[PDB]
Amino acid sequence: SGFRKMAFPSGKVEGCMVQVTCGTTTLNGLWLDDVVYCPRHVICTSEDMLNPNYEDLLIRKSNHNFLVQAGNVQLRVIGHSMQNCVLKLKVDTANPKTPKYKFVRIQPGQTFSVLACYNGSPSGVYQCAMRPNFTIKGSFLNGSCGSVGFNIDYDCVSFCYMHHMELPTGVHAGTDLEGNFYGPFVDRQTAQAAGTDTTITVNVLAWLYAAVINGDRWFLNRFTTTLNDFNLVAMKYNYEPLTQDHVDILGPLSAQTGIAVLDMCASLKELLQNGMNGRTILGSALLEDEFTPFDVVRQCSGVT
Amino acid sequence: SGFRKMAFPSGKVEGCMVQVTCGTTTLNGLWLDDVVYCPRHVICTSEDMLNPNYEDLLIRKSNHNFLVQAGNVQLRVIGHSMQNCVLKLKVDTANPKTPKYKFVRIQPGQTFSVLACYNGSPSGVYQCAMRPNFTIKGSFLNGSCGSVGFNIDYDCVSFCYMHHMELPTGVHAGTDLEGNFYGPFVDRQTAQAAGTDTTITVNVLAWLYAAVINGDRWFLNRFTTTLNDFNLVAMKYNYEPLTQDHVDILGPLSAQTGIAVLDMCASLKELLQNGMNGRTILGSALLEDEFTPFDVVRQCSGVT
Ligand SMILES: *CC(=O)N1CCN(Cc2cccc3c(CCNC(C)=O)c[nH]c23)CC1
Ligand SMILES: *CC(=O)N1CCN(Cc2cccc3c(CCNC(C)=O)c[nH]c23)CC1
């Protein structure tokens, strides 16, 4: 027992990290097979960052301008191309440590692990959720760009994120591995509005189910509610409206604990309206929304 | 910017994990060079767990009874010995993936990453602190025993923990890599008192410094305090007394932010006496104590 914000083991991704340098700018790249993927802003200087014309900036660059170093060994760049906001540098050597992998575009509300890197070297790993507003609340300093987010299903790494920027608000924005940004963000140093964020209701309910499984039960009550009633409360407190799809995903946890999903909604309703009266749930003094129903089941069943 | 409970990249440790089976019991082992380290209770059945005589149980076992599997390859066991609460199985093959490593006994209040494993397969990674009462609040299910805790300094892994047990209270106990338990715990299925836990004061102050660096400043006040005064409040709220050694360790963060350590103590004093009035600090609604001053500096400076 016990419940922690657990990230996937990062080994398979550490073996893919490389340093990409173009001119004076250095960031991280992801080496899979004979291709290195990195943010296209590796070709900018601070002089260009306010309003870059990426097509024009990339035209002044040749394969020999992209310096790719895997730890201490230099990769020979034999092709370069821009796809959306990523650069794909074809190298002459396939990464011997390339795991089985997929490129996936995750949905808002889903979670993933991030391997923060600096100069191609992994520094740490943590679990994130893609916010409903398509930002992530990460931990990224200058040089962390090109660090990736991923999920691991047995032997397969599904890469879902590459870090590109920090908003003036301190939240993070990035792309899928095809270079398409999550959200309305553009890779330009400009004021950018992150939309109104909401709390991921299905994840809070999943975490309440994890709390019951792990012993924390004080919040369970004698009440029930309806999806309509619950959603009136969800709206007042800026929670995502709960749908039957969310109830269906919570089915396994509802079955394991014997607590009907709408009964758990009534516990959540009372916690929203009354607060936690100074108590904690799974060591937290707030309602946690960064565990999906899949994460809770995995952490409570023991999947490797 | 941004602040997260970040664990070390687990790659170097994933390459050391093996499955150890003895009779019907399976747990995890750590393969470093030609030795596999695992909890000695791998030789028990539930029939033995209430009051085992480990010396007698180990005498009924031969090298061929210890089945060690590294992923899909079987290791040949050529020696076995018990050191405190660990077994050391000498194998005929040195682990090709053995990183540079040390065995260290961490101090209470220090942090480390845990790579939770099942059947020799890594499932996830999270950051822990060794509680002042020598327990850890982890996430471990049956079969997780033998999972290890560690720190990573550039290329060197310092193994500090091996998981052995869950107390009836749900907290976790284990040993250093010489098999010596942290705390008064014994590897026997019996009622065991974890001492009174305290909050790691120097870590809460370190996390308040991380909050200031990352923008969360609402808690800073116009007050100061003394070590004596602060410690009267620390005692009332079950915080560890602050010493000059703790002030000295906070020196770098005090210098970086320009907030004198005793001024930060006065902010902490007011948070303890007044609570957080429904506000948050670094996304938390409670005072976080699982970041050391070293962790905060590493996460805020970018060390890989
Ligand atoms: C992650 C990293 O290493 N960074 C250093 C280079 N920075 C360049 C860059 C790229 C795209 C968008 C940028 C913005 C958006 C506005 N943000 C702020 C804080 O003003 C700023 N710099 C950008 C990315 C970060
Ligand atoms: C971690 C793991 O895989 N476990 C399964 C085997 N268990 C055996 C064991 C070893 C040492 C001490 C034990 C206790 C102490 C009392 N705890 C409770 C909850 O009653 C129980 N089982 C023990 C360890 C866990």
From Swiss-Prot, chains A, B:
Reactions it catalyzes:
TSAVLQ-|-SGFRK-NH2 and SGVTFQ-|-GKFKK the two peptides corresponding to the two self-cleavage sites of the SARS 3C-like proteinase are the two most reactive peptide substrates. The enzyme exhibits a strong preference for substrates containing Gln at P1 position and Leu at P2 position
Q: Where in the cell is it found?
A: Host cytoplasm; Host Golgi apparatus; Host nucleus
List of catalytic residues: H41, C145
Instruction: Give start-end of the signal peptide.
Output: none
Q: Which domain of life is it from?
A: Viruses
Q: Which residues form the Peptidase C30 domain?
A: 1-304
- In this entry, the parts of the chain located on the Cytoplasmic side of the membrane are 1-304
Instruction: Indicate the cross-link positions, Glycyl lysine isopeptide (Lys-Gly) (interchain with G-Cter in ubiquitin).
Output: K5, K90
Q: What regulates this protein's activity?
A: Inhibited by pyridone-containing alpha-ketoamides compounds 13a and 13b. In turn, alpha-ketoamide 13b (tert-butyl (1-((S)-1-(((S)-4-(benzylamino)-3,4-dioxo-1-((S)-2-oxopyrrolidin-3-yl)butan-2-yl)amino)-3-cyclopropyl-1-oxopropan-2-yl)-2-oxo-1,2-dihydropyridin-3-yl)carbamate) inhibits SARS-CoV-2 replication in human lung cells. Inhibited ex vivo by michael acceptor inhibitor N3. Inhibited ex vivo by compound 11a and 11b.
Q: How does it assemble?
A: 3CL-PRO exists as monomer and homodimer. Only the homodimer shows catalytic activity. Interacts with host FBXO22; this interaction promotes the proteasomal degradation of nsp5.
What's its job?
A: Cleaves the C-terminus of replicase polyprotein at 11 sites. Recognizes substrates containing the core sequence [ILMVF]-Q-|-[SGACN]. Cleaves and inactivates human TRMT1, preventing tRNA guanine(26)-dimethylation of tRNAs. May cleave human NLRP1 in lung epithelial cells, thereby activating the NLRP1 inflammasome pathway. May cleave human GSDMD, triggering alternative GSDME-mediated epithelial cell death upon activation of the NLRP1 inflammasome, which may enhance the release interleukins 1B, 6, 16 and 18. Also able to bind an ADP-ribose-1''-phosphate (ADRP).
Question: In its UniProt entry, what is this protein called?
Answer: 3C-like proteinase nsp5
Annotated organism of origin: Severe acute respiratory syndrome coronavirus 2 (2019-nCoV)
Gene giving rise to this polypeptide: rep
